[PDB]
Amino acid sequence: AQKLAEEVPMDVASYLYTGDSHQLKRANCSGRYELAGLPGKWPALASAHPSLHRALDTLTHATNFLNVMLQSNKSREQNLQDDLDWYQALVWSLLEGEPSISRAAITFSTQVFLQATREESRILLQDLSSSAPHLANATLETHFKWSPPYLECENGSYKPGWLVTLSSAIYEFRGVMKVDINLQKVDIDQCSSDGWFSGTHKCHLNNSECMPIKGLGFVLGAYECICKAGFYHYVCLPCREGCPFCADDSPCFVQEDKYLRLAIISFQALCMLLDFVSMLVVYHFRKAKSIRASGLILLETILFGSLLLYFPVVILYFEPSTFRCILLRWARLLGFATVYGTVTLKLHRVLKVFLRVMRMLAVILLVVFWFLIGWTSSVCQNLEKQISLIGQGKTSDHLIFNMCLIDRWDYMTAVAEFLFLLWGVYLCYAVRTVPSAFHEPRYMAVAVHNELIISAIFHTIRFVLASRLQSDWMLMLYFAHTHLTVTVTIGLLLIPKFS
Amino acid sequence: QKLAEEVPMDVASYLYTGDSHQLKRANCSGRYELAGLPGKWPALASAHPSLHRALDTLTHATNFLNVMLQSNKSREQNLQDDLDWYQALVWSLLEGEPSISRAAITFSTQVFLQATREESRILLQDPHLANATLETHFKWSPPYLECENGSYKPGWLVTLSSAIYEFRGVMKVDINLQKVDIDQCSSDGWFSGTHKCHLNNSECMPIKGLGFVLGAYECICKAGFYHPAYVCLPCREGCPFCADDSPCFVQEDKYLRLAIISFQALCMLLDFVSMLVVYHFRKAKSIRASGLILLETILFGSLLLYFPVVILYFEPSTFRCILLRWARLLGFATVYGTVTLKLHRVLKVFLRVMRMLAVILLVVFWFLIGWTSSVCQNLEKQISLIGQGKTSDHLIFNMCLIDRWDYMTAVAEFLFLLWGVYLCYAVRTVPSAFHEPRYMAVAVHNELIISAIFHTIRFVLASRLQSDWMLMLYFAHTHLTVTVTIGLLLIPKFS
């Protein structure tokens, strides 16, 4: 909030405050004290580096000692002979204790003053008021008195150190003691809650975090903004998708040949439309030798089942959800039933006549619905929200991909399909020479064996290696599998009834 | 360790250093002062800032005297007017901090001055430390109790000592270390040991109040409870919060459980000898209606159907619940299937069944295999277990759990018996040699009603059923249903 004000009230110091480099500041011509009154905070009585605290502690003891000596009975005011020696020793003592105090001075008038500075390694002293002198300010107040940040000027040359005046009254006021703490080698944290001008004006919220350096100098721009799960290119930005550790801002999710996806879905919808078209057609041709050999209801049922079996191809095109996988199972399972049950049930009707199918079908769908209702409940109730989840993102050893998962339930269902087809294989093997005007049983058995073999292969391939199948190979596998099986099973039962 | 050595070198102070009650100490007459020589450490720690403040005020006053007396033109007409300066010097040495009791400086440049915060007015007036200073920077001391024409004075003092320049001076502050809390269970603090609290099963937990006093800690025993000196106890079998050290694994009568198992095994043996008898009477006029293979099939199903009453008598495990499911399901099938199918044969003749039975057995084995696999493969090790713990009022009990699979199973049994019901209602006017359909239908209706009631009561409130009530319920259900179903088909074939 003051970053703009700080960038419009400095010329030589401006660079020095942001870089620590004395080489510009030493060439800048000075005219008076170059301190800052407003850019800083309220005060440094709480949040301050240890040095400052010690600096104040020194003055405190030196102020209490003088106060008690000035408030003692029969105050002599014999400042001529040896009082000046006491005060000079009291000032050299004031300096000698803290390792971060650069000048110190004492002055009073009731007309002399002494000061000292840490010159090279020893204390230089002089008989002249030198350093801090808030006497004019203390008199105007007439306790403690701090000051702002300020650069000292020596022989018309901006000093290369940031000083602070501390001032305290001597007791009515009649003295001003002042230490000039050298605040040049102090730490400052713009990311701290309550401290020296806590302004972290470089990284606010978006993938932001301030982890600053410990030992740098009384200088700013020393706080490495951290990219909280994002890209690091002294700037933080967002990442392509749900893929953290963006060592590059490149993508993690595999690509999709959409050109190959739209053809897939379009051909599937074409086949579904043609199936519905076939159902209407058979509803038109109800007086031919269709009805006599194979009832209309059974054929419309087969076609509705096949329509109910194309669903997986379109379910897999969309993004994997947890409502989808379930519908994938319902469709597959229920259509298999309503299609091959009546297929083999029709064969059963034949073998029985050689020596009433809907009642003997609804048993199948009842068992099916019972199993489905159970599976769905066990998933939705316990293993969808509590611990387990179907939708799983697996890695291809360098890239990820989502998919529906499999479970033992699928293994046993495939086995059921196998055995249910086994009954039809033996049934078809039995009726190998039964009188027929249209030879339907021949085509039925072909469909049955096709489904059995093709389904075994597909299920094996699906359950072996589902950890390394991206979302464009499974689509092709489900498409080539369903097209072969179902389209053959439809043609073999429909085609011959028009010729 | 030095806890035993600290409890063998005290008389009155020992109790005054653990309670902090001046009322005993003030009655104990003492010649001179005494201090705890053994302070299990030295005076160079950062436990309280007070000591830091009183070292700061001492080092700041010692830095002045050492830089004044040793400065240039130090002529030192020491008796004329310097005394005024030194008096202001010592008076201000204790008029800066809040906890410093006496302060004094001695010099030969003998001369000495002192000042003490008496009540609220700091009076200003005109040994070991000075002697050790002559013998020998900063020089601290240990914890020590003062006393003079008093008793052992009721205050813990510390001597701070320094020198000037050689050794021509001795300034001392007596920091009042009486209002300084101590952590007996700190990693680094004064008296940092363990009076009588073993961490094997417990944790200290210090407080923030009182004053310097040993035994200022309330120990906490984890995985157990304390005596209601405070020390720890190993808790009861598998019960982590023992408000009492009483047991949680609820009382279970044995002279009921034994009778139950006895009666069940008696019925099994009676069922087995019911099988052998049938195998003796392979020749009769009764079996022509109800074949031999059908009855032995019913009796073997019944025999295994009894299993649930004996499984629950044992401690429940993961292998147990699974066999409970298998047995119940498998036996229901192999009995009521052939029952219902005999009625079907009757109705069809009115206008073998082993081949029309293995279908059901196949469907059952298929579901069982799947259920067992999904259980043992996923939800037995990952996050999920069969062992479930419920509570009756405020007390626990172990048992097997249920899952939606059981509800759907019950529905299947219902529907299978509704087929039997219709099949029984269709055949209500046939002639017969033994009126078997009459008793069969009686068994079916009974099975349906009792089966519905039991499964409902079983699912509704299984979280509040201690492990002696479920056994009684299984006893009642299985005895009623199965024993009726056996009698109604067997009994009439001997009369």
UniProtKB/Swiss-Prot annotation, chain A:
Effect recorded for E440H? Induces an increase of cAMP levels
Result of mutating K346E? Does not affect G protein alpha subunit activation
| Extracellular side of membrane | 1-261, 319-322, 379-407, 465-473
Q: List the disulfide bonds.
A: C29-C153, C325-C404
Sequence segments annotated as region (Cache-like region): 15-162
The cellular location(s) given in this protein's UniProt record come to: Cell membrane; Postsynaptic cell membrane; Presynaptic cell membrane; Nucleus
Glycan-modified residues: N28, N73, N137, N155, N206
Q: Which residues form a coiled coil?
A: none
State where glycine binds: S102, R103, E152, D180
Record comment regarding domains: The Cache-like region shares similarity with the Cache domain, a well-known receptor for amino acids. It acts as a ligand-binding module that recognizes and binds glycine and taurine.
Q: What is this protein called?
A: Metabotropic glycine receptor
What is this protein's gene name? GPR158
